[PDB]
What we know:
The PDB classes it as hydrolase/structural protein. Keywords: hydrolase-structural protein complex, bbsome, coat complex. The assembly is dimeric. Crystal structure of BBS1N in complex with ARL6DN, soaked with mercury. Chain A is bardet-biedl syndrome 1 protein. The structure holds two protein chains of two kinds. By secondary structure, chain A is mainly beta. Chain A has one domain (1-304). Chain A has no helices and 30 strands. In chain A, the strands form seven sheets. In chain A, strands 6, 7, 8, 9 and 10 form a five-stranded antiparallel beta sheet that branches. In chain A, strands 15, 16, 17, 18 and 19 form a five-stranded antiparallel beta sheet that branches. Chain A has a four-stranded antiparallel beta sheet with strand order 1-30-29-28, with no helix packed on it. In chain A, a hairpin with a 3-residue loop joins strand 6 (65-69) and strand 7 (73-78). The two termini of chain A are 14 Å apart. Chain B is of the alpha/beta class. Chain B is built from four helices and six strands. Chain B has a six-stranded mixed beta sheet with strand order 2-3-1-4-5-6, sandwiched between helices. Chain B is globular, with a radius of gyration of 14 Å. Chains A and B meet through strand 1 of A and helix 2 of B. The structure holds guanosine-5'-triphosphate (GTP), mercury (II) ion (13 copies) and magnesium ion (MG). The site of one mercury (II) ion (HG) has 6 residues of chain A, from strand 13 and strand 14.
Amino acid sequence: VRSVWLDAFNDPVAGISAYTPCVHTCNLFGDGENRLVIADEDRKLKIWKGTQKASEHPLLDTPVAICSYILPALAVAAGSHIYIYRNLRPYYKFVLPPETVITCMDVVKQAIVSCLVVGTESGRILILNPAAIVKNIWVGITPAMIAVQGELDVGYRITVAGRDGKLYHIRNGELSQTIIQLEAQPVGLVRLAKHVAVGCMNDVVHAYTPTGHKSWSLYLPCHILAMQRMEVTGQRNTKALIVALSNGEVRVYNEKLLVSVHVSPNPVTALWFGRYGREDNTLLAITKSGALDIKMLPRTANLE
Amino acid sequence: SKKVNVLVVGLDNSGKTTIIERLKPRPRQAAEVAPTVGFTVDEVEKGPLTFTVFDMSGAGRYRTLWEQYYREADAVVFVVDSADKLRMVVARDEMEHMLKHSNMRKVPILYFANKKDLPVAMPPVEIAQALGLDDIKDRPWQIVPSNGLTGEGVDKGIDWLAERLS
Ligand SMILES: Nc1nc2c(ncn2[C@@H]2O[C@H](COP(=O)(O)OP(=O)(O)OP(=O)(O)O)[C@@H](O)[C@H]2O)c(=O)[nH]1
Ligand SMILES: [Hg+2]
Ligand SMILES: [Hg+2]
Ligand SMILES: [Hg+2]
Ligand SMILES: [Hg+2]
Ligand SMILES: [Hg+2]
Ligand SMILES: [Hg+2]
Ligand SMILES: [Hg+2]
Ligand SMILES: [Hg+2]
Ligand SMILES: [Hg+2]
Ligand SMILES: [Hg+2]
Ligand SMILES: [Hg+2]
Ligand SMILES: [Hg+2]
Ligand SMILES: [Hg+2]
Ligand SMILES: [Mg+2]
């Protein structure tokens, strides 16, 4: 009903043109205070610290996704290349052997240091060395978005939403035969506590266990623009879901229960929840108007 | 003398500990300062007054400890890192919960607008704005810009606080 959030800071006139896969927070400068990392459509990589833009750096191609793994390593994908950078400066220009275009990329925990995971328009999913293409897994369809849960040592699951409106699962290297046929097309894919949340073009989020059981369903008034996990650690210990709609509103569901609503003057293209600055529970949103909005969650705010 | 309890609170890294250093005699003071761990009770002299200074951590994890000390507090020092425009609201929220708490009496609050030296540091008046300090009308309060490295403002502040306690 109300908004749980504290309004931290707003910059209407930031110049940011990015969607969720190209937004990130990391501890690059090791100094505890985390920084916002954006691969803008500028083909420029922008770095934010606190309320002000810290740095800007040129990128060769226009970006599709940026991850950060293990101290830190900013990895920018574009086309068929993946440029690993180090200490803000460029470091390497890896290229996947085609037969190619990179569609989505994310990371997997090595044990309990992480390892880069890549989706290619070809229909392959690659897991790589802590710097070379280590695993190549074939899935029928062109991946629309992917999510990783687990650690590659003990055991891990890779969920794939296909452009064919299907849901794919990969448990420990093998592509399962369990394929779910969804109505509309994929729009976002967020890994939660007991399941993954898929959002379809017909304004609905579905929650799916790896088995294929459908835990719940969320029915939304307008169109989904962005989805994102909101992991609050500590006593409150919940893994919420943030959905932002083209009608401007941003919602937090604790499982099936709507927990907060606020509305941005502009439609959110990118959502990030994590550490930024010295605060653990920070919501960073980038609007289509290019604005940057930061809200952060009270200590006492319950999400039931 | 007279013994009084002074609670020192504020977000992590505002400079509570550093500002508390500048209240000790100049030979006692230490060079670098470790990020407070849990909390540290200390003692300090200032004229006819003896301050028992409870220096808390302002880290997420530890904020739940401040309330342990509200009942006894006779005055509160509240440190704000002026250059952290970002967390002002968090700063505000915690301040508000403190004021709310049924244990915290209407004792005087002294806010240090610390790190006045930093390039992007916020003006005392903008800080008092974000925190909504003007709304405080049942307690004596005061905001004093400060440099905790140099010690600038600190005494001016403590001096103010001492008037109210006398
Ligand atoms: N530039 C500048 N730096 C300061 C100032 N005051 C403290 N610092 C430095 O900023 C950091 C603050 O340290 P602390 O005094 O321990 O912060 P704190 O209030 O004790 O917060 P805790 O983490 O809970 O201990 C350290 O690097 C300080 O030495 C200041 O007035 N100006
Ligand atoms: Hg990091
Ligand atoms: Hg990182
Ligand atoms: Hg991009
Ligand atoms: Hg992108
Ligand atoms: Hg990533
Ligand atoms: Hg993708
Ligand atoms: Hg791994
Ligand atoms: Hg690996
Ligand atoms: Hg690998
Ligand atoms: Hg690896
Ligand atoms: Hg789908
Ligand atoms: Hg779908
Ligand atoms: Hg509250
Ligand atoms: Mg301290």
